[PDB]
């Protein structure tokens, strides 16, 4: 039909499955600690999250 | 000074050599290397009896031990390509054969947490 074939390809493994929580960028996802926040975005909200630049 | 209370008062290598007919020879004593990293089979034909004594000693010092805790103990480095060397588990069938054979001899046992020595097994090596 019109949408019967739409999005028929199964995407379960994940490079185009997992997306950033806010940015939606498909590269550089920080899946550590389950953030699912890709870079260039976690840096903005790391202070809000609780992460601070220490040594 | 020097006093004897257990087998920790002698060197490990000489005791193993001094500890080397129940251990019947299997069919793969010649066509088998002691692991997967290695590229050559053991040289001495008595290599099992050196390995058999060593595996007994590992059970002696480490009470709760398993087969996979012996595969990592008798491991080596993978230096077969241009990649940097990384650790790799040793062969399993050669290692677990001695333990099963030691089970019939009455030296080792099968506890709920792996393998452990027996009454006669501890006594036999001390003498």
């Amino acid at each position: 039909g019109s949408y019967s074939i739409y999005n028929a390809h199964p995407r379960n493994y994940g490079n185009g499955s997992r997306t950033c929580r806010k940015c939606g960028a498909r590269k550089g996802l920080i899946r550590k600690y389950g953030l699912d926040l890709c870079r260039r975005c976690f840096r903005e909200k790391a202070v809000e999250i609780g992460f601070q630049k220490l040594d | 000074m020097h006093h004897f209370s257990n087998i920790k008062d002698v060197v490990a290598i000489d005791f193993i050599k001094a500890y080397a007919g129940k251990l019947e020879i299997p069919e793969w004593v010649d066509t088998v290397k002691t692991g997967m990293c290695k590229e050559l089979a053991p040289l001495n034909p008595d290599w099992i009896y050196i390995r058999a004594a060593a595996i007994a000693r590992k059970v002696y010092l480490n009470n709760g031990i398993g087969v996979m805790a012996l595969r990592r103990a008798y491991g080596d480095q993978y230096n077969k390509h241009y990649n940097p060397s990384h650790r790799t588990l040793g062969s399993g069938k050669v290692n677990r054969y001695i333990l099963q054979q030691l089970e019939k001899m009455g030296i080792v046992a099968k506890i709920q947490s792996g393998r452990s020595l027996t009454k006669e097994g501890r006594k036999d090596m001390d003498k």
């Binding site: - | 000074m1 020097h2 006093h3 257990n6 920790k8 008062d9 002698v10 060197v11």
Partner: protein, 137 residues
């Protein structure tokens, strides 16, 4: 009396008590150390002040870190420190003072730990100071 010897990471926790001049490290005699090239090194305190001081002393030293040489340098520390502490808690301080003077005269590290420790790798290089090669052209 319990003392300790320190190194990079290796720690040699001892237990000084009266005995028969017997020294065991993790259950094995000190004569049966794994790196035999360092057999003499760990025994240096024994010949520095003589074995009569250690004749009636027992030592039970446990090592729980470092490497083969870091532990060996901690063993010599806990041995020398144990004699100092035993001569302090029970024997008079005058006798300990002459013993410490000979120890500190030979090797200061025998009685105090090395403050040096590993540094931290930084971005843009393989080590603490070294950096990656630069390709101008």
């Amino acid at each position: 009396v319990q003392v300790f010897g320190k190194k990079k990471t290796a720690i040699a926790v001892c237990l000084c008590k009266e005995g028969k001049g017997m020294i065991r490290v993790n259950g094995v005699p000190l004569d049966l150390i794994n790196p035999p090239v360092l057999r003499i090194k760990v025994f240096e305190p024994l010949f520095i002040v003589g074995k009569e001081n250690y004749a009636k002393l027992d030592l039970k030293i446990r090592v729980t870190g470092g490497g083969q040489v870091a532990q060996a340098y901690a063993i010599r520390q806990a041995i020398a420190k144990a004699l100092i502490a035993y001569n302090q808690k029970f024997v008079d301080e005058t006798t300990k003072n002459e013993l410490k003077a000979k120890f500190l005269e030979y090797d200061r590290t025998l009685l105090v730990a090395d403050p040096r420790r590993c540094e931290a790798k930084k971005f843009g290089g393989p080590g603490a100071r070294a950096k990656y090669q630069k390709s101008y052209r």
